[PDB]
Design a protein around this nucleic acid. Sequence first.
DNA 1: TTTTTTTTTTTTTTTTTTTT
DNA 2: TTTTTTTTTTTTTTTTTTTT
Lengths: 135, 135, 135, 135, 135, 135
Amino acid sequence: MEIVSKLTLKTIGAQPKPHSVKENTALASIYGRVRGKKVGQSTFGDFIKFEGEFEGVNIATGEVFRSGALILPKVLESLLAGAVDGENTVDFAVEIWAKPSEKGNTGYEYGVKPLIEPAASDELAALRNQVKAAL
Amino acid sequence: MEIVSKLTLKTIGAQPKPHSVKENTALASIYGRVRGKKVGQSTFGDFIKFEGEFEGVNIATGEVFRSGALILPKVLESLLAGAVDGENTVDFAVEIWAKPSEKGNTGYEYGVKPLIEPAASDELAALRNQVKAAL
Amino acid sequence: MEIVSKLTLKTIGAQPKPHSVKENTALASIYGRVRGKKVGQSTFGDFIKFEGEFEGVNIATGEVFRSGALILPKVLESLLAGAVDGENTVDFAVEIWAKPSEKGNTGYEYGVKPLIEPAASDELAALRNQVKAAL
Amino acid sequence: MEIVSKLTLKTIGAQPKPHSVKENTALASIYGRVRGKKVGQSTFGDFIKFEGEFEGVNIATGEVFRSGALILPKVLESLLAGAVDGENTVDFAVEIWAKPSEKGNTGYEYGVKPLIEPAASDELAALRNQVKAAL
Amino acid sequence: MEIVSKLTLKTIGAQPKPHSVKENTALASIYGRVRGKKVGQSTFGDFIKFEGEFEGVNIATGEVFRSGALILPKVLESLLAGAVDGENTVDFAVEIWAKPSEKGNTGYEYGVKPLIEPAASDELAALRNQVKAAL
Amino acid sequence: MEIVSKLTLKTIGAQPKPHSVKENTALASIYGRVRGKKVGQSTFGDFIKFEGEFEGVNIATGEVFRSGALILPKVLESLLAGAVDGENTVDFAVEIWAKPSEKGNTGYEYGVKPLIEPAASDELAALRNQVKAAL
DNA sequence: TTTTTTTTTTTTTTTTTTTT
DNA sequence: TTTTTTTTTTTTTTTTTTTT
């Protein structure tokens, strides 16, 4: 266990080196509870920093990390931020992947595979049932 | 055993020389009991000095030190201070590391790997259990 | 020998695959004589196409190509175009390299190592002589 | 010989890696003629880009480079810019060094050792003569 | 054996000359029994003088001294004085070192390496046991 | 010759290491012309920075430096500043020494031996003549 | 023939790159 | 006496048809 001021793919040694992803690969698993959010500015745009209890795991090393702060990429950030608003404490758990990206300045794009089944409306459930009926 | 007025990475000869860390490395192991804290001012900001029984160990020399005073870096200081308040006596034990830090005035950043398992809520334990279930 | 309508790094199989250059590497050697130039438009901007006698050589295969048309990258294009104007026939010979490029959409940047010694003024020759004098 | 769009310590592979200079070391030798200057803006401030004939030499590899553009560090930039103004063509030649710099974000500071003897007033020449007289 | 009115680093010829310590060095070994203490005033502050049986040994000469009075530096003085109170007779034994001290008016700082194992609480013993368990 | 932004004993490698001067020793020779002065603030007090043409020479290496800025110790600073006021250009030349200093935080004190004979009143000249008469 | 000299809190960190 | 800062970047390449 390593205590970190802020939990990032770089802190937990999961950020790939540029032009290094030849196949889809998992990097980290991040789970925790979120109490609040704050918006900050950087050279590359605005970002959200989360407050709560967070644990992190690298998969090429098995190292386990823990923090009270979390900065995620923009996609996971958008999803979680849409999932949190106000005084409610939000539980989350996700596995972060890396995929090759031609026409990318880094050569990879991040993927998101959640580990908690998310909420789906009864209507799309009906659609899945209809699909599973014919064939 | 060497008795020191105050226990620091510099006292126990663990402070790296600037621009000297090429790979992650452990410097010291510090354990003790804390009775109180005091806040002091310096050129570079405020700092906390701890009172109690403290023992220290360098890893490149095996030298063992002991003191009744302790000054830590800011991160460990914040964690321990949040862990101590009032008349209670707090036991602690940590291993201090050094990591390279590009864009740093010293070239390194300190790491914290505790040796006593810290307290985690039942909720995050449930999250870890859920993660360990699928795969 | 393979006759090609237009000589390009893609025609002679020298264009690297995106996110594939880990170290500096030579791709092709191109030499020929230039009689004229024409300017054309594409999605990514304007380009110059050269007319004359051109031969090309891949270095990972030894394959030899020959054409009467030549399209080069923008840097080599600028140099050669500045070297050609009017009815004069211009001889040229260059070796094309590939270098890693972080923050690049392809991961590499092209290099130019000429094989004919280019023209340098007597003044810079004097400067080189002065440099070679002290030490 | 390698032709480069702009000549920099990074282009000619002379820029040291952060936290790598343990002793004073020469990196490059740059000589050329300057015809004009242009001022540009970046994240870290304004910079001057020079136009003319420039040749460069790395000392750990012997590689020789040549360009028509030149961007230098701020100190050499200030000196040369003060040395150039208007339509005059300015000859210059300098050897660039690297020195350790505690309290530096990179760990090194650049040095300048010119290879052409610069201009000194007759008064300071008189001073040097007086110094060389007593002892 | 040399009998001295008061035992000091100066009496036993162990006090370093200013600006003379280039590396850590042992100066003296002092052991004895303490019966009482007295507080005295000087230009540089107050000091404690001890009464009992004291023997001293220089390490660069092997000379052996003995006295019934003892004046120590402030750190050893504080430790021993905290170790003595009342009619009890206190046994002690310590080795005195010298360490370089930049920003010091003498260039050195004294070190204390006791030769009798001191008293440590069962709690810190438990901590040392826990530390010695994981790795 | 090395061009430096500011000329100091540290820039020209003349500053002694603490607790290193065992005998009087010359470090540097500094001569130049002064056009103006500016007052700046630091942690340790205010200081004067000089503008003009300055050359410097280390004596343990023979290295020669040159700058347009100069910061001196407090004594030389006071003397020169008293020697400069207004639009006049002031010529100066001095040899800087180092002397042991017991009760000093560095172990040395700087000395000043000018190389240009300074101005003495006719009265003190008369005194020297009277002294040289009797014996 | 004497009490004299020794010590100081220092440094260490920063959001960055990923997508189109 | 000590300090009195210094450096980082300052982009690249992609295509530019071909056959029936």
